[PDB]
Amino acid sequence: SGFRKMAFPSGKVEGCMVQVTCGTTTLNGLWLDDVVYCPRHVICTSEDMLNPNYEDLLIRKSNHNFLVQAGNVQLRVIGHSMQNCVLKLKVDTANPKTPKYKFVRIQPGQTFSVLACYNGSPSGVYQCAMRPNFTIKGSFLNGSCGSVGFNIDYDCVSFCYMHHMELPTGVHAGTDLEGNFYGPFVDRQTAQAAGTDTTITVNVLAWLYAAVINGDRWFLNRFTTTLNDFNLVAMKYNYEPLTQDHVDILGPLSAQTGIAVLDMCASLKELLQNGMNGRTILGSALLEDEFTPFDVVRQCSGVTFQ
Amino acid sequence: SGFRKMAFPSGKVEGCMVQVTCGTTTLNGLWLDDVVYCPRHVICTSEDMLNPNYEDLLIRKSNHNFLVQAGNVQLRVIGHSMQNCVLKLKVDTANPKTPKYKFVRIQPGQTFSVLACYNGSPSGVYQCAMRPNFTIKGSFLNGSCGSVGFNIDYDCVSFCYMHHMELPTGVHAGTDLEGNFYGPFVDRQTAQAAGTDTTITVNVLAWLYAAVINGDRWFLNRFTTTLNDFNLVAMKYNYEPLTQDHVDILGPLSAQTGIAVLDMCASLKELLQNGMNGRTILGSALLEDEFTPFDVVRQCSGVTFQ
Ligand SMILES: *[C@H](O)[C@H](C[C@@H]1CCNC1=O)NC(=O)[C@H](CC(C)C)NC(=O)OCc1ccccc1
Ligand SMILES: *[C@H](O)[C@H](C[C@@H]1CCNC1=O)NC(=O)[C@H](CC(C)C)NC(=O)OCc1ccccc1
DSSP: OOOOOOOOOHHHTTTTTTEETTTTEEEEEEEEEEEEEEEEGGGGOOTTSSSOHHHHHHHOOOGGGGGEETEEEEOOOOEEEETTTTEEEESSOOTTTTOOOOEEETTTTOOOEEEHHHHHHEEEEEEEEEOOOBBBOOOOOOTTTTTTEEEEETTTTEEEEEEEEEEEOOOOOEEESOBBBBBSSOSSSSSOOOOOOOHHHHHHHHHHHHHHHTTTTTTTOOOOHHHHHHHHHHHHTOOOOHHHHHHHHHHHHHHHOOOOHHHHHHHHHHHHHHTTTOOOOOTSSOOOOOOOOHHHHHHHSOOOOO | OOOOBBBBOOOHHTTTTEEEEEEEEEEEEEEEETTTEEEEGOOTTGGGGGGGOOHHHTTOOOOOGGGEEEEEEEEEEEEEEETTEEEEESSSSSOTTTSSSSEOOOOTEEEEEEEETTEEEEEEEEEEEEOSSBBBBBOOTTTTOOOEEEETTEOOOOOOOOEEEETSSSSSEEETSSOOOOOOOOOSSOOOOOOOOOOOOHHHHHHHHHHTTTTTTOOOSSSOOHHHHHHHHHHTTBBOOOOOHHHHHTHHHHHHHTOOHHHHHHHHHHHHHHTTOOOOBBBBBOOOOOOHHHHHHHHSSSOOOO
């Protein structure tokens, strides 16, 4: 037993990280088949980035201005192009270590693993949630751009995120691998505005279910509640509204625990109005919202990939 | 910026996980060169495990009773032997994906990444600390035995932990890869006693330094303290005593922040006596102690492996 924030095994993605250089900017790219993907601001200098005209900047570049390195061996750029905020470099060699993969645009509230990279070299892996306001709470330094977020189902790697920028708020913003930002963000060095962040209610419930599965059962109470009775309390506390579709997603967890979902909502309601009184749940003094119901079921049994 | 609990990239270790079967028990083994390492209780039935005579149980086994599988391909056992609580299976083929590696016995307070495995197949990765009482707070289900904990320096994998058992307390116990348990534990299914756990003071300070590096600076105060003045407060709160060698380990973090270490101890003293007053530090309502000073410096800049 036990419950930990768990990332996917990163081996399949490690083999796809390369270094992309152009000017003095170096960052990470993703090498799949004969195409390298990286953030398009690799083509900016430090002055460009305040309001870059990316089309005019890319025009001044040719294939040989793009140095791509995988370890110490290397590809040549036989073509380049811009798709939204990513650059695609067509290269000599198809990556021999290309995993089965898809590109997916994930939804707010879903989680993924981030392989943090510097100079094309993997550095660490951790789990993140796409916040309701389309930011992530990451760990990214200069050079980290082009690090990717992914899920593994099967032997199949679903890439969902490429890192581009840190907002002066301290949280992080990026694109899908077609180069479209999550959220309202643009790739320029300007003060940019994330919305109010809300707590992912269905994730908090799933973690309360994980807590019961693991012996933490004190918060379980006497009360019950209705869906709209709870949703009134949810908006008081900036929790995203709970729907019937959320209830049904929790069905498996409800059936393994024998605790009805709105029995679980009633415990959550009192935690929100009464606090935790200095006690803890799965070793945390806060309500955790970065576990999806699938994360919980995975970890609590299943938990197996090619 | 930002600060997250980060595991090492797991690719090098994924290639070493195999399935070891003997009877109906299946668990994970580690395949390095032509030797497979796994917990010796793979040779027990469900009745043996209450007080197994491992030597007498191993004698009834021969090489062909040990089914070792790496993916779907497979090795033959040309020799077996017991070293402390691990079985070593000499096998046909040297693992083509063997990384450069060493076996190390880590010290209390150090951290490592755990690659959780089931049926020889990697499932997830997360970071753990060896507690002062030689347990870890893990996430392990049935079948997880033989999963390993490791560090990466270089391209060099330092294996330090193999998982064996869950204590009725809920925390986890295991051996080094020479088969010697961390702590007083034995591999039998008996109620077993971990000591009082203490908080790793030097790790908490390192995380407070990480907090200051990342903008969380409210806890920084006015006071100072002496080493033994702090150590009196530390034993009140079951914190391990702070020594001069701990101070010097924190030197780098002190010099990047400009905050003297016993200036940092004074802030920690007031957190311990006054609580956090419902505020948070790096998004946590508790004092975190599973980051070493090296973890902090790694993540806060460096953070790069083969
Ligand atoms: C790409 O490597 C970099 C990632 C930033 C670096 C600091 N923390 C991150 O997540 N992205 C940028 O530098 C980005 C470039 C624009 C053209 C998109 N600008 C940016 O994110 O400004 C925020 C910032 C810059 C430098 C240090 C701290 C924050
Ligand atoms: C090895 O796969 C297994 C790992 C346990 C399984 C449950 N959570 C774990 O960490 N180890 C054992 O089953 C161990 C065998 C002895 C001969 C060492 N016995 C044990 O740990 O008992 C505790 C336990 C057993 C089953 C479920 C929950 C706890």
